[PDB]
């Protein structure tokens, strides 16, 4: 139950080294308006310059200028830029992953994985640059041709959260760039440094490619900066990941991609492989300290095996190594800030008040080793019913355990929450697996068999349903949200249908 | 010679009866059916309350729970049967369309035929609704994307296409496993009652659930209750408040909100083709299509001759009773439509325009409650305010250009973005117009006008038109939910 | 109680007449129509010569020149009309199918319904036939892929599905803008004549070209002339020489050449489900489907109980007149089919097999010219020669396994590769069977037998089955030619 | 009319340098069975070891072993191999292009372009590795699911020609590898060295990736080696590019991709931009010394402009710089061998015998500067009709000029030849452009507007119709030919349709 944590100064030096290697000019970005910080110790690292709302508008207009050139640049040439950027990400993978650990608190292997996701979406987007497929199709009209074409849309506003500080932007920017769009990115106020590093690498790729300078810009600021971006008439698409954005953008006839959180469950049936299940559940519940939109928060377990599953998860949660995310031994790093810790404790108290039993975890670990940081053991809570606290997502590592008998009851328990991001079923039974994925099964955007709620990869469309917000990012044909469809009828016959047969001559 | 109100009423009652409507059950005192042919009220109807809308959604949701597990090809059999009944009653439904919308008989028949055609397309879709299978990075896993029924679809339609818009939505939604609650225009309730009765027959013939489709007749408050329902995940609206309201409750919308459609006429344009296409697209349906041609952007070297030829055509357009086959232009829907038209033309002349032809009310004494008008042709010195904001009336504004990029800019400058066309014999001009830096609309055509669209194409527009697509290509995806499914068959945990 | 030849002849003549066939015009002395129900000749028919095949191709090619520019949705209207006529005459056509193929009435009805269903699917396709638009690397250029009508399609069909295979080919080919020349099995000419007459009515109703479809009745030399025609770019053959011959003249083929289909029965299989599925897939159509279940690969722990249960089922199968609704198994097509069956069973017992049930000729005195047989169940010690080469007869070979990878290897070891199934309650076994290292067939199913297929799926197989696909998904692409089109609108030469 | 040509010795030294840089072991590949050669001088460079037919069978079996591992290696992992290979091609682009010039005689800029095509298809294939899309679709059966899946096929035999000695293999191998297939490549007997270099680079990528060793092998030999590859029962797909292969493979129920040549035309209408047209026609007719399958061989010109077009093409052909393909000034390098030159001269003689007029070119240039090499000026021949010599493709730079009046006549003249690879129309008229591309227009696999018969790129499917052979390679969904389709119905209902309602229990 004890851990050595890196000092703020050692963290700052590592951040500075990483930023400089990624080509950031520290003198130019430093200032006294905002502050970079680290959840590893809770402390401020150094001050940053901020953009004003007026600067956001200047950025959007510059991005629109760039768009006017980029939209007629051939998609395969646009893909060459993205290929160059992927090369630079590859070259600086370890440097960027350092920044991700520093700002989001993720363990090293997860930080590296997030940067690799960026590299993987660049590879995918380079492929898409020769596709972006529309259709050709028959027309009913003699001597006509009909097709559907896809065109670049305009400036895309990207609003990202602290928890995936680089991959969410990459999913959006790699795709948007190859689609002939330009990007203005408002990163989380908690994670500016990762964004600055990403932007500097992309600016080098842009300079190497001879591409337009305003293809991507980062706006560093607080909430008034984000609002100005959301409200811009020159931003036809806003992608927001990790609540008010949908209706405000719809009001000005813009488009949104929303992925707004998840309250994700897994069903454990009587035939589940318990070794597989426990391993999967622990990773999905405890990974990233319970701060993924896809984190496992509800486990719906058949009454015949619930006691044994709870025993095993209790033991696994008790053995989880919690500590500095730079240490190879660490599996759980810190929560992002005090507010997060407070919400976690409030939820666990309310759960025991609504009838629950705390089985494992929930306590702050080694508070005196880093007093400004909140390292916590993931909580396992057995619940007699799916009460309000279980239905209302807390962004923390709390796994509520519910029991069921009939699979249709498990499905109902999965579906009855307002969120609809991901779901999983652990079963050896062919029919149960298929029933879960059927139209009357789990209602979520992602529905998996024998893999947890974080089972997703670049090639799939990523997003959810219900209050998650309906958007899709990354794979399949999510790229269509970054373009506009045109239906084109071409007459080569020299004639038109004459109304009531009349020829006006 | 305008048909009499008594004759029209009798024709409406006979059509409704033949389509299976129970006149006693739908008659009442809350709302009135009317006709633009004379302006007269036909007879009174029962209305639904907001509470009835909630009951209808409940019924549709109950039906959905059964329908969503009914195999899609079986769902397609219902739509095939509906198409057969529409075919059987094409003339009766078309008479109701002419009576309530005022459109000429041939256009009314064409609208009912669109219904039949989308039924046939949806029967095809019922065996497709394609998702994907694709590789996964994880050993001993499989990955796919599936599409599932969404739920209850609310359909809000306008007076001008009182049956085809609902059919695009309902044929597709039903084969997608959804159910529908339809709020038709308060101007055109009878067409909806007839449609609903024919679909209820098909439902009976198929043994399908009774709540698959319901019509709610009423005013604003009925439509508002439908839009705000938490059990209506998709609202399809044709006719602006809807988008944000639905977004606020995390629902989905398909919005097609109007059009201010232009065509560009280049110096190599075939003028006989262009004049015919422009006249039909500007004057057709008395200028009351979402896809009506409202702006003609003509090259300065041919502008005088084009205006001369359109003036002559507009002066010759046959205006009259839409049940007479000689008629090209039927009446406007109501007095307010006429008022708005006149206000636009007055504004245009105050903004420097010249009225070249049309605009006058025709034979007011033949039917004082009806508004038959000659389409207006107005030459404008620039794209001023009145040109940029559409009026749902037959007014064609003529603008001039020299460089094609400026014609394109003029096309694109307005807030609407539904359809556009270019008339040209030049291969490169045609391609430029359709290019990524060309016309910005949802529909962009060469040598065919702004109503050049068909069932197999996705229909809808950009910008303030609202972004939705209906009908063809893969528009059906808006009626379903995508799932991404990873299946592990390895017995091991492999993380990405 | 077997229907008499005179009764059958009269029923055949009435069906043909009702379908629009002119009996005087088709009767003759060159070929004979026959029935497997009694083995009797029904009546004589005129035959085509090789020169008539060349005239038919010429006529089809002339029709093609018009049809290929007829808009696909208009082509789809013809197929929709055909589907309506098939629906009207479903019973009459089904009677001809039972008479000539010997299949039970319910299966004959199902085959005609497949025709109607592919017509409805093809009507959908008529608005799709999708190519692509995509980006080009070249500034000021556009790139697309389009699909165009191919030409005359030769269709060679077998006795066992005398109408549905031609319908899969003809509905799709016609909406794709192709024309068809059909050479039906010499065993089943009457069904083809009836089909052709109904389609000719639809053609007349639509005002379409008369040469869209033609039937050539004859022997080997007629089929050979069709295969070798330089004006037939696609040959679709169901029933081995065809592939190389057509390739030699740079034509295209779709080949579906037979099946030796297996199912794997795992220890967690639901035995009631499995026995029912196996009996129906092995015995259905007297074992004369391309998709008939011929090999059952059963886990050693349940093999004895499975064999016991199948023995009991096979002993209870009702064999008899296919016009009687009590019948499950009708007759084999002819004496040669019976001879081949007996030879296979004799070979299997010589290779170490045990005949567990069936194989005996039923009621030979009731109809001495007809071959009614009880399906045979043979337990085998290994997959020997007789197991690996299919016999078109109802024989089910039972093999045992222990490890699933060995069941998969046994499935895959044969030269045919049409369909396969796995019966299991185990999620991972189901997935393993369908995985890239699982069953190698064109169709691979879980908890449904080897005939588990439907209109919306691409149908066909791998290996010596021939590689072709018909019916659903994007099988239609084999009936068209792809073009890749780059359009320069820049006025400059930009090289790749 | 004069030129300095590199010496055989200088060429040999450059070839050796390139091979060594690409990681070929010269001692291991050298021998006395076969010979590497160069069309620049006509001479042999050095001897090579050859494979026997027995070695081909050994190679196929090793490739099948590799296939058994590769087919279950996840497609995105397979794409990582292809990405690494593209990196190595990038690093050795100039070295490989040297070999292409040496063996095929292509000018430097075309050789570099061919190697870049390899790099571009690797990028595309890396994208495809996350796609390979099948379908999910409704079933009519309650409580069932239906899908279509694509699986790796097996060993792919690649037979390539001298004229594109690296890109054709790359189109096949990049796609085949990501599709989970393995490859046995028989390069042209005229161009082994390019193949050896390609294979050595891919073997390094394989070693870096830890992939199976037998993923790709080159078999060096004469015709008996190719025949053994074509006839193998373990080779389910044979791709042959640049006549007997179709029927022989069909006989053993294999699949083929055939692209067997082209006799490609362009139509020049009265409204054609003549500067654009002449430039495009000269590149398309004279490029690669008329030795592309897509070379322009027939020009179908409207009678109103035919005289002026012929004048302009006459002047352009007379100004073409012919010489050593390593010199930046050179636009036309040599024909491949004496046999090619002999066929060219025979065709031009026969054309003048069938009524034609030689307008420009056709003569051997500077024979004494490289007596074993055949540098020729492209020939322009005006023909009064499309006679047998015009219909029968000669693999040499001969442009036959035909006149027309009605566009339907031009279309008929395009279509009446037995080949059907590519076609173009040069026109400013919107309706003519569309008529040419319509279903009753040009019948070829590739049909272009205002670009010549070599207007194709990676993203499009490449191939032709009629006696060209029907295959498609490279872009769109040509990848489907490298895989097998499965239709999968999955029952989760626990029941089956009972025949005649009978339950056997």
PDB file of C-alpha atoms in Angstrom, chain A residues 323-475:
ATOM      1  CA  UNK A 323       1.210   4.694  -8.067  1.00  0.00           C
ATOM      2  CA  UNK A 324       3.255   6.934 -10.315  1.00  0.00           C
ATOM      3  CA  UNK A 325       2.152   6.375 -13.932  1.00  0.00           C
ATOM      4  CA  UNK A 326       5.776   6.599 -15.110  1.00  0.00           C
ATOM      5  CA  UNK A 327       6.674   3.441 -13.160  1.00  0.00           C
ATOM      6  CA  UNK A 328       6.323   0.223 -15.175  1.00  0.00           C
ATOM      7  CA  UNK A 329       4.736  -1.473 -12.123  1.00  0.00           C
ATOM      8  CA  UNK A 330       1.811   0.964 -11.983  1.00  0.00           C
ATOM      9  CA  UNK A 331      -1.600  -0.062 -13.372  1.00  0.00           C
ATOM     10  CA  UNK A 332      -3.716   2.735 -11.807  1.00  0.00           C
ATOM     11  CA  UNK A 333      -2.509   6.334 -11.852  1.00  0.00           C
ATOM     12  CA  UNK A 334      -4.211   9.310 -10.242  1.00  0.00           C
ATOM     13  CA  UNK A 335      -7.638  10.882 -10.807  1.00  0.00           C
ATOM     14  CA  UNK A 336      -7.414  14.182 -12.677  1.00  0.00           C
ATOM     15  CA  UNK A 337      -8.162  16.647  -9.817  1.00  0.00           C
ATOM     16  CA  UNK A 338      -9.728  17.115  -6.422  1.00  0.00           C
ATOM     17  CA  UNK A 339     -13.217  17.720  -7.887  1.00  0.00           C
ATOM     18  CA  UNK A 340     -13.043  14.226  -9.414  1.00  0.00           C
ATOM     19  CA  UNK A 341     -12.090  12.657  -6.134  1.00  0.00           C
ATOM     20  CA  UNK A 342     -14.939  14.525  -4.348  1.00  0.00           C
ATOM     21  CA  UNK A 343     -17.489  13.271  -6.860  1.00  0.00           C
ATOM     22  CA  UNK A 344     -16.202   9.730  -6.449  1.00  0.00           C
ATOM     23  CA  UNK A 345     -16.503   9.805  -2.674  1.00  0.00           C
ATOM     24  CA  UNK A 346     -19.966  11.352  -2.857  1.00  0.00           C
ATOM     25  CA  UNK A 347     -21.130   8.582  -5.196  1.00  0.00           C
ATOM     26  CA  UNK A 348     -19.774   5.759  -3.079  1.00  0.00           C
ATOM     27  CA  UNK A 349     -21.457   7.275   0.038  1.00  0.00           C
ATOM     28  CA  UNK A 350     -24.760   7.677  -1.784  1.00  0.00           C
ATOM     29  CA  UNK A 351     -24.536   4.081  -3.078  1.00  0.00           C
ATOM     30  CA  UNK A 352     -24.161   2.711   0.446  1.00  0.00           C
ATOM     31  CA  UNK A 353     -27.114   4.963   1.437  1.00  0.00           C
ATOM     32  CA  UNK A 354     -29.269   3.579  -1.470  1.00  0.00           C
ATOM     33  CA  UNK A 355     -28.612  -0.003   0.032  1.00  0.00           C
ATOM     34  CA  UNK A 356     -25.223  -0.904  -1.475  1.00  0.00           C
ATOM     35  CA  UNK A 357     -22.252  -2.701   0.009  1.00  0.00           C
ATOM     36  CA  UNK A 358     -18.698  -1.509  -0.619  1.00  0.00           C
ATOM     37  CA  UNK A 359     -16.756  -4.714  -1.331  1.00  0.00           C
ATOM     38  CA  UNK A 360     -13.326  -3.330  -2.200  1.00  0.00           C
ATOM     39  CA  UNK A 361     -11.472  -0.071  -2.658  1.00  0.00           C
ATOM     40  CA  UNK A 362     -12.631   3.466  -2.754  1.00  0.00           C
ATOM     41  CA  UNK A 363      -9.972   4.919  -0.443  1.00  0.00           C
ATOM     42  CA  UNK A 364      -7.425   7.602  -1.220  1.00  0.00           C
ATOM     43  CA  UNK A 365      -3.968   6.010  -1.313  1.00  0.00           C
ATOM     44  CA  UNK A 366      -0.798   7.615   0.170  1.00  0.00           C
ATOM     45  CA  UNK A 367      -2.177  11.217   0.554  1.00  0.00           C
ATOM     46  CA  UNK A 368       1.008  12.440   2.252  1.00  0.00           C
ATOM     47  CA  UNK A 369       3.271  11.253  -0.679  1.00  0.00           C
ATOM     48  CA  UNK A 370       1.615  13.760  -3.053  1.00  0.00           C
ATOM     49  CA  UNK A 371      -0.882  15.900  -1.131  1.00  0.00           C
ATOM     50  CA  UNK A 372      -2.196  17.738  -4.125  1.00  0.00           C
ATOM     51  CA  UNK A 373      -2.865  14.450  -6.068  1.00  0.00           C
ATOM     52  CA  UNK A 374      -5.655  11.954  -5.763  1.00  0.00           C
ATOM     53  CA  UNK A 375      -4.575   8.347  -6.163  1.00  0.00           C
ATOM     54  CA  UNK A 376      -7.497   6.078  -5.376  1.00  0.00           C
ATOM     55  CA  UNK A 377      -8.156   2.363  -5.306  1.00  0.00           C
ATOM     56  CA  UNK A 378     -11.013   1.495  -7.725  1.00  0.00           C
ATOM     57  CA  UNK A 379     -14.287   0.803  -5.813  1.00  0.00           C
ATOM     58  CA  UNK A 380     -16.405  -2.377  -6.156  1.00  0.00           C
ATOM     59  CA  UNK A 381     -19.953  -1.879  -4.914  1.00  0.00           C
ATOM     60  CA  UNK A 382     -22.690  -4.484  -4.744  1.00  0.00           C
ATOM     61  CA  UNK A 383     -26.122  -2.990  -5.355  1.00  0.00           C
ATOM     62  CA  UNK A 384     -29.543  -4.535  -4.690  1.00  0.00           C
ATOM     63  CA  UNK A 385     -31.125  -2.563  -7.549  1.00  0.00           C
ATOM     64  CA  UNK A 386     -30.204  -0.099 -10.254  1.00  0.00           C
ATOM     65  CA  UNK A 387     -30.898   3.056  -8.240  1.00  0.00           C
ATOM     66  CA  UNK A 388     -30.336   6.675  -9.190  1.00  0.00           C
ATOM     67  CA  UNK A 389     -26.637   6.671  -8.245  1.00  0.00           C
ATOM     68  CA  UNK A 390     -25.997   3.679 -10.520  1.00  0.00           C
ATOM     69  CA  UNK A 391     -27.862   5.344 -13.424  1.00  0.00           C
ATOM     70  CA  UNK A 392     -26.001   8.656 -13.086  1.00  0.00           C
ATOM     71  CA  UNK A 393     -22.395   8.257 -14.332  1.00  0.00           C
ATOM     72  CA  UNK A 394     -19.544   9.334 -12.052  1.00  0.00           C
ATOM     73  CA  UNK A 395     -16.196   9.804 -13.893  1.00  0.00           C
ATOM     74  CA  UNK A 396     -14.269   7.640 -11.494  1.00  0.00           C
ATOM     75  CA  UNK A 397     -13.424   3.991 -10.940  1.00  0.00           C
ATOM     76  CA  UNK A 398     -16.630   2.630  -9.359  1.00  0.00           C
ATOM     77  CA  UNK A 399     -17.985  -0.719 -10.521  1.00  0.00           C
ATOM     78  CA  UNK A 400     -21.560  -1.367  -9.427  1.00  0.00           C
ATOM     79  CA  UNK A 401     -22.554  -5.064  -9.325  1.00  0.00           C
ATOM     80  CA  UNK A 402     -26.172  -5.980 -10.090  1.00  0.00           C
ATOM     81  CA  UNK A 403     -27.664  -9.471 -10.304  1.00  0.00           C
ATOM     82  CA  UNK A 404     -30.138 -10.979 -12.773  1.00  0.00           C
ATOM     83  CA  UNK A 405     -31.827 -14.268 -13.674  1.00  0.00           C
ATOM     84  CA  UNK A 406     -33.315 -14.048 -17.206  1.00  0.00           C
ATOM     85  CA  UNK A 407     -31.203 -12.674 -20.053  1.00  0.00           C
ATOM     86  CA  UNK A 408     -34.018 -10.350 -21.090  1.00  0.00           C
ATOM     87  CA  UNK A 409     -33.750  -8.849 -17.557  1.00  0.00           C
ATOM     88  CA  UNK A 410     -29.994  -8.362 -18.025  1.00  0.00           C
ATOM     89  CA  UNK A 411     -30.674  -6.632 -21.340  1.00  0.00           C
ATOM     90  CA  UNK A 412     -33.284  -4.353 -19.731  1.00  0.00           C
ATOM     91  CA  UNK A 413     -30.795  -3.480 -16.931  1.00  0.00           C
ATOM     92  CA  UNK A 414     -28.217  -2.636 -19.582  1.00  0.00           C
ATOM     93  CA  UNK A 415     -30.588  -0.484 -21.548  1.00  0.00           C
ATOM     94  CA  UNK A 416     -32.513   1.414 -18.886  1.00  0.00           C
ATOM     95  CA  UNK A 417     -29.813   4.125 -18.270  1.00  0.00           C
ATOM     96  CA  UNK A 418     -29.824   7.408 -20.213  1.00  0.00           C
ATOM     97  CA  UNK A 419     -26.328   6.830 -21.744  1.00  0.00           C
ATOM     98  CA  UNK A 420     -25.696   4.372 -24.652  1.00  0.00           C
ATOM     99  CA  UNK A 421     -22.044   4.141 -25.464  1.00  0.00           C
ATOM    100  CA  UNK A 422     -20.775   0.556 -25.032  1.00  0.00           C
ATOM    101  CA  UNK A 423     -21.870  -2.853 -23.698  1.00  0.00           C
ATOM    102  CA  UNK A 424     -20.406  -6.346 -23.448  1.00  0.00           C
ATOM    103  CA  UNK A 425     -21.553  -9.869 -22.729  1.00  0.00           C
ATOM    104  CA  UNK A 426     -19.349 -12.636 -21.364  1.00  0.00           C
ATOM    105  CA  UNK A 427     -20.751 -15.977 -22.312  1.00  0.00           C
ATOM    106  CA  UNK A 428     -19.847 -19.346 -23.866  1.00  0.00           C
ATOM    107  CA  UNK A 429     -23.393 -19.725 -25.187  1.00  0.00           C
ATOM    108  CA  UNK A 430     -23.890 -19.036 -28.873  1.00  0.00           C
ATOM    109  CA  UNK A 431     -27.529 -18.000 -28.537  1.00  0.00           C
ATOM    110  CA  UNK A 432     -26.913 -15.591 -25.621  1.00  0.00           C
ATOM    111  CA  UNK A 433     -24.154 -13.886 -27.523  1.00  0.00           C
ATOM    112  CA  UNK A 434     -26.419 -13.392 -30.525  1.00  0.00           C
ATOM    113  CA  UNK A 435     -29.454 -12.328 -28.439  1.00  0.00           C
ATOM    114  CA  UNK A 436     -27.320  -9.560 -26.827  1.00  0.00           C
ATOM    115  CA  UNK A 437     -26.338  -8.151 -30.266  1.00  0.00           C
ATOM    116  CA  UNK A 438     -29.809  -8.502 -31.769  1.00  0.00           C
ATOM    117  CA  UNK A 439     -32.193  -5.561 -32.437  1.00  0.00           C
ATOM    118  CA  UNK A 440     -33.931  -6.240 -29.119  1.00  0.00           C
ATOM    119  CA  UNK A 441     -30.641  -6.684 -27.302  1.00  0.00           C
ATOM    120  CA  UNK A 442     -28.181  -4.142 -25.979  1.00  0.00           C
ATOM    121  CA  UNK A 443     -29.098  -0.656 -27.315  1.00  0.00           C
ATOM    122  CA  UNK A 444     -25.631   0.886 -27.332  1.00  0.00           C
ATOM    123  CA  UNK A 445     -23.362   2.174 -30.110  1.00  0.00           C
ATOM    124  CA  UNK A 446     -20.792  -0.536 -29.295  1.00  0.00           C
ATOM    125  CA  UNK A 447     -21.944  -4.047 -28.296  1.00  0.00           C
ATOM    126  CA  UNK A 448     -19.298  -6.728 -27.800  1.00  0.00           C
ATOM    127  CA  UNK A 449     -18.965 -10.434 -26.948  1.00  0.00           C
ATOM    128  CA  UNK A 450     -16.242 -11.703 -24.584  1.00  0.00           C
ATOM    129  CA  UNK A 451     -14.431  -8.366 -24.607  1.00  0.00           C
ATOM    130  CA  UNK A 452     -15.098  -5.385 -22.346  1.00  0.00           C
ATOM    131  CA  UNK A 453     -16.567  -1.954 -22.898  1.00  0.00           C
ATOM    132  CA  UNK A 454     -13.246  -0.419 -24.123  1.00  0.00           C
ATOM    133  CA  UNK A 455     -13.134  -3.052 -26.995  1.00  0.00           C
ATOM    134  CA  UNK A 456     -12.916  -0.730 -30.012  1.00  0.00           C
ATOM    135  CA  UNK A 457     -10.237   0.032 -32.616  1.00  0.00           C
ATOM    136  CA  UNK A 458      -9.555   2.534 -35.396  1.00  0.00           C
ATOM    137  CA  UNK A 459     -11.398   0.667 -38.121  1.00  0.00           C
ATOM    138  CA  UNK A 460     -14.773   0.736 -36.382  1.00  0.00           C
ATOM    139  CA  UNK A 461     -17.092   3.755 -36.128  1.00  0.00           C
ATOM    140  CA  UNK A 462     -16.828   5.017 -32.550  1.00  0.00           C
ATOM    141  CA  UNK A 463     -19.730   6.608 -30.633  1.00  0.00           C
ATOM    142  CA  UNK A 464     -23.002   6.017 -28.961  1.00  0.00           C
ATOM    143  CA  UNK A 465     -26.688   6.464 -28.704  1.00  0.00           C
ATOM    144  CA  UNK A 466     -29.248   8.137 -26.409  1.00  0.00           C
ATOM    145  CA  UNK A 467     -27.639  10.827 -24.150  1.00  0.00           C
ATOM    146  CA  UNK A 468     -24.198   9.856 -25.402  1.00  0.00           C
ATOM    147  CA  UNK A 469     -25.224  12.054 -28.381  1.00  0.00           C
ATOM    148  CA  UNK A 470     -25.335   9.983 -31.554  1.00  0.00           C
ATOM    149  CA  UNK A 471     -22.053  10.955 -33.217  1.00  0.00           C
ATOM    150  CA  UNK A 472     -19.530   8.622 -34.871  1.00  0.00           C
ATOM    151  CA  UNK A 473     -15.798   9.191 -35.236  1.00  0.00           C
ATOM    152  CA  UNK A 474     -12.764   7.289 -36.549  1.00  0.00           C
ATOM    153  CA  UNK A 475     -13.502   4.277 -38.765  1.00  0.00           C
TER     154      UNK A 475
END
